[PDB]
């Protein structure tokens, strides 16, 4: 079909967040069988394999941003691979890893489709500059490189010289914001980004939230949608084995509803499953709940509706 | 600012409910740092300290109501302290303890503002008389002393001779009722109190419930609002270390939404955090979830919106 034609791109990268272990991000999302659970329904899955990420030995930090050249090279390599799989007409399923990969995962996606939108399901806004950061991590700063309206307010970080800004401020929608910096909320209200934080999700319900999201991004003109999902955007009772768990977020139900309404537009054209950390489960059953949740999110992105799916042939014979 | 000017009043009192341990109610809500988590945003926090509660040795019971003089003296002392901090223009953050303190926590609040309203978030209605009770506890009877329409149906309990009724029947709104006596529901339907039990919360959603609550109390005239929150009004998967846990209640999300919509009226003028019992957690992690939940509820009452908060100065420099 046009949709559910998946090119999986693994990304074992952990130098944008401190809690290591997301190097085994694609390892666990594949050994829990994302491919074979995609291959029941008609998903032409082509595994492009995990990427080889080089290890720069002289990784001198920035002022506050630490390990910047590793993230620059990893996101440049990932943006090349994503533009490769989007010139093949597939849907770039990137799965990591951490949100420090989303710089390349959206830049390479915009090398093929320059007028996309991003639905950013995360607990956090991830919109810090290298100046407004307090953390100094790059799993908290992907969006600020990608917005066109923050050019000039971003210093020339070592490694990010290739990053051309790709999306506008009014072409990114947040869902599930509940842990926002003061600097992040100042940027979020200055640029006027249409966000749906947990206040608005509790106000409207996830049906009205997804309706207003799809009317905001697709109501003007049909265009590709890049769900950059994150697994702390769900509640930690569903995904506890994630890097920065923030309590009281989206349920497993509401997460599946977001993904199903993105699928039934028929314009999902890129997906990110980030921050899966299979070593922060206090039991391995916690890791099992996290990875089964992320697998079910990915499957509901690519056609597994909870109502069920039938092949269009007769079964009553 | 006008709001978020908090005068904290501790209240280590446990003689209105049988499960002792809420004597260490303010002890744990302060050693989890409610003050310092208030002091990031501009909250002029002034700790008025825990109260000294005298121990009456000849505490003879009533017919069914047991320990009545201790609750009478504790609520008289607390009502004096609350009227003291409301003549200072602050917001009376009372935190206990148990709902047997809410008699004084609303009487002293009405010594300064005689036309207030109460949003009563509890699993229970707490509206028993000393006659209609079966429990004989006073954590189940604060509201009946405070309603003006139950004068004459309340016997002269030893200790409660000072209690002048303060609020009317149509100036109190319940949210989260799911464990109601027959006597309590008879009073609740005879007086016509506008309650939002879990049937109406599931029907309308917490957005429509809080909209109808604020339209019911503030739609006629601007007046102070006294959120008397209780931590069994939330679901026991979020606050298990409470005195009378009733399953299937408000989520952590819906609880934070109630508090945020009370804040954004700009008329919150008194707060109660009651029934926190740090010895009923079966693990200390259960106590940790309870106290972090109650701290997050209090912070969202006093300005911590989940969208984030910025100081009104430039950060992009």
């Amino acid at each position, epitope marked *: 079909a046009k949709s559910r034609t998946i090119g999986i791109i693994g990304a074992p990268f952990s130098k944008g967040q401190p809690r290591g272990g997301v190097e085994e991000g694609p390892t666990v999302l594949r050994k829990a069988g994302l491919l074979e659970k995609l291959k029941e329904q008609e998903c032409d899955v082509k595994d492009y394999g995990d990427l080889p990420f080089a290890d720069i030995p002289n990784d001198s930090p920035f002022q506050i941003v630490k390990n910047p050249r590793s993230v620059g090279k990893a996101s440049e390599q990932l943006a090349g691979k994503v533009a490769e799989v989007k010139k093949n007409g597939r849907i770039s399923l990137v799965l990591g890893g951490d949100h420090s990969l989303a710089i390349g995962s959206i830049s390479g996606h915009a090398r093929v489709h320059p007028d996309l939108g991003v639905i950013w399901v995360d607990a956090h806004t991830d919109i810090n500059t290298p100046l407004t950061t307090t953390s100094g991590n790059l799993h908290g700063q992907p969006v600020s490189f990608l917005l066109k309206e923050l050019k000039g307010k971003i210093p020339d970080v070592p490694g990010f010289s290739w990053v051309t800004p790709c999306i506008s401020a009014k072409d990114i929608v947040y869902i599930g914001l509940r842990d926002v910096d003061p600097g992040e909320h100042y940027i979020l209200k200055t640029l006027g980004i249409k966000y749906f934080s947990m206040t608005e999700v509790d106000r409207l319900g996830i049906g009205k939230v997804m309706e207003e999201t799809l009317s905001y991004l697709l109501g003007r003109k049909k265009r590709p949608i890049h769900l950059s999902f994150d697994v702390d955007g769900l509640d930690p009772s569903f995904t506890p084995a994630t890097g920065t768990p923030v309590v009281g977020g989206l349920t497993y139900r509401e997460g599946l509803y977001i993904t199903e309404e993105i699928y039934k537009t028929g314009l999902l054209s890129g997906l990110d499953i980030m921050e899966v950390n299979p070593s922060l489960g206090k039991t391995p059953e916690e890791v099992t709940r996290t990875v089964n949740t992320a697998v079910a999110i990915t499957l509901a992105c690519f056609g597994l509706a909870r109502e069920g799916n039938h092949k269009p042939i007769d079964y009553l014979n | 600012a006008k709001s978020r000017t908090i005068g904290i009043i501790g209240a280590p009192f446990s003689k209105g409910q049988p499960r002792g341990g809420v004597e260490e109610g303010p002890t744990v809500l302060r050693k989890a740092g409610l003050l*310092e988590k208030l002091k990031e945003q501009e909250c002029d926090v002034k700790d008025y300290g825990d109260l000294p509660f005298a121990d009456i040795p000849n505490d003879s019971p009533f017919q069914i109501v047991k320990n009545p003089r201790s609750v009478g003296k504790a609520s008289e002392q607390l009502a004096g302290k609350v009227a003291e901090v409301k003549k200072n223009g602050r917001i009376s953050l009372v935190l206990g303890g148990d709902h047997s303190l809410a008699i004084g926590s609303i009487s002293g609040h009405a010594r300064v503002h005689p036309d207030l309203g109460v949003i009563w978030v509890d699993a229970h209605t707490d509206i028993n008389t000393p006659l209609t009770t079966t429990s004989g506890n006073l954590h189940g009877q604060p509201v009946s002393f405070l309603l003006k329409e139950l004068k004459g149906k309340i016997p002269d309990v030893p200790g409660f001779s000072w209690v002048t009724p303060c609020i009317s029947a149509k100036d109190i709104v319940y949210i989260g009722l799911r464990d109601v006596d027959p006597g309590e529901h008879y009073i609740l339907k005879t007086l016509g109190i506008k309650y939002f039990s879990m049937t109406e919360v599931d029907r309308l959603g917490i957005g429509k419930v809080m909209e109808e609550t604020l339209s019911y109390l503030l739609g006629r005239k601007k007046r102070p609002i006294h959120l008397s929150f209780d931590v069994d009004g939330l679901d026991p998967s979020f606050t298990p270390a409470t005195g009378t846990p009733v399953v299937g209640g408000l989520t952590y999300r819906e609880g934070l939404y109630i508090t945020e919509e009370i804040y954004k009226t700009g008329l919150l003028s008194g707060l109660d955090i009651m029934e926190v019992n740090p010895s009923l957690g079966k693990t200390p992690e259960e106590v940790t979830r309870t106290v972090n939940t109650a701290v997050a509820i209090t912070l969202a009452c006093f300005g911590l919106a989940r969208e984030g908060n910025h100081k009104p100065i430039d950060y992009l420099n």
Partner: antibody
Amino acid sequence: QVQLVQSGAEVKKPGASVKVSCKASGYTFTNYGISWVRQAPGQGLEWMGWISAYNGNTNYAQKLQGRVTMTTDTSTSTAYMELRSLRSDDTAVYYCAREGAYGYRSPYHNWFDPWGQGTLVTVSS
Amino acid sequence: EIVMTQSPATLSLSPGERATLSCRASQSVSSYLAWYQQKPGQAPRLLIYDASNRATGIPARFSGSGSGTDFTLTISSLEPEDFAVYYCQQHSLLPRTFGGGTKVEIKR
């Protein structure tokens, strides 16, 4: 300056807990997370748990799950480490050091630089 | 449960030349481990925070290398006050094992 003060050298027979204070001065608390590490004399340093001061995250270690409980006292910035069902293998010096909270606002830190001065704990009857 | 192994079990080097050490991991810690200076009966003072970069009050002489399996601690300007039981510590995997002990003696 940035310090951690411990108190005190306590001996418990096999009995009750070894709740040890670790008073955090100099830096802003609720912005880092204190971990704990034991050292038998003439031996290595076994890690034994880490609380965050952002929000009370437990995150204990293997072989004692179980035995340790760890809370915060973030008004007076001390951090506590209890033990349960004590045993004569726990004749160790209990250090406390600061990992940094691995939440989202807390600065990058992996490397233990306030270290407390150590606490003599010998468990014997 | 990554076991961290230190290749010099003991060491005895005079006040003088370089005193290079080794800490071999069981996996790829990838530029995420630390170095300590535990004098006997004292608190283990930090030498190197993340495989290099000379943490905040280290005098002049304690550079190191790593990235990402076996990491080297170099003592280029030996300075005989530095005769302390050194320790390496992985951090970026749980549980957080340390090294074993690298008791630098004195040569006579």
